[PDB]
Subunit: 108 residues, 3 copies
């Protein structure tokens, strides 16, 4: 799984590194992990869900990697989840976000 | 039994011992195993509300037993203490409940 | 020139040396030692509200001193700034207050018995 996440994140980041909004994508990629850790999953996703296209691009890519159709669907899932599933989703988002962060710092 | 934590451990030990005998010992254990992370990651109030809203009697018994180990009549009473507490008292109850929950988890693992 | 955190460290140092001369320095130290913990476990907003609702002058003084070290008028201005801050600014403010608080704690441990 981590490898599937590693691969998918790498794929998304490579594709993002060819766009004019790479620096902004990178900024969001490196910031999301700490946001999820300190503000909690739902607050972090709401922050991403709210200006520049590049920032939300990270959220959507990450959501897709997790098998969700878009950032909103992941946000919807986190809010609908019962407590145990919420913590599981947080752990999952955190792990996948670290990959986006690492490949973003290496490829951008 | 000198230690305060040790006192909670021995009382928790007795509760788990009882629970291991009846039916639903598996569900009790399942809850005993998750309560610590619930308290750590979600906070005391949410953790207790989760346990108190579970359908299974075995899941709620864990909470009831932990409350009694800490000096409360039951989970409802413990949850009320948490909602009435001022900040320092709430953080203290949080540490208290977490410590007791860890003992329940450990003994459930060894006895059920 | 001194780094940002170095400035806070030294201003905190001055605030503590001054509290060491007044009455209630023991209560001042108690609050200084407890604040970092509250910010980490309860969050910035909650930690600040706890300090502001204290009835003992020495406890509240720690709060106003820290806010001044950070460049605010007093605890009330810092608290409002925390409530109005959007997420990133709130997390950044949290880091700053926690860093300043740790210095108050450290100097209280060294200067107030």
């Amino acid at each position: 799984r981590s490898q599937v996440w590693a691969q998918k994140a790498y794929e998304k980041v490579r594709e993002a590194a060819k766009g004019e909004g790479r620096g902004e994508y990178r900024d969001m990629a490196l910031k999301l992990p700490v946001l999820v850790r300190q503000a909690g999953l739902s607050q972090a996703l709401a922050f991403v869900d709210s200006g520049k296209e590049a920032h939300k691009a990270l959220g959507n890519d990450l959501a897709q990697v997790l098998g969700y159709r878009d950032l909103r669907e992941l946000a919807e899932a986190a809010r609908e989840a019962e407590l145990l599933q919420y913590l599981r989703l947080t752990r999952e988002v955190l792990a996948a976000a670290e990959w986006f962060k690492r490949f973003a710092q290496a490829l951008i």
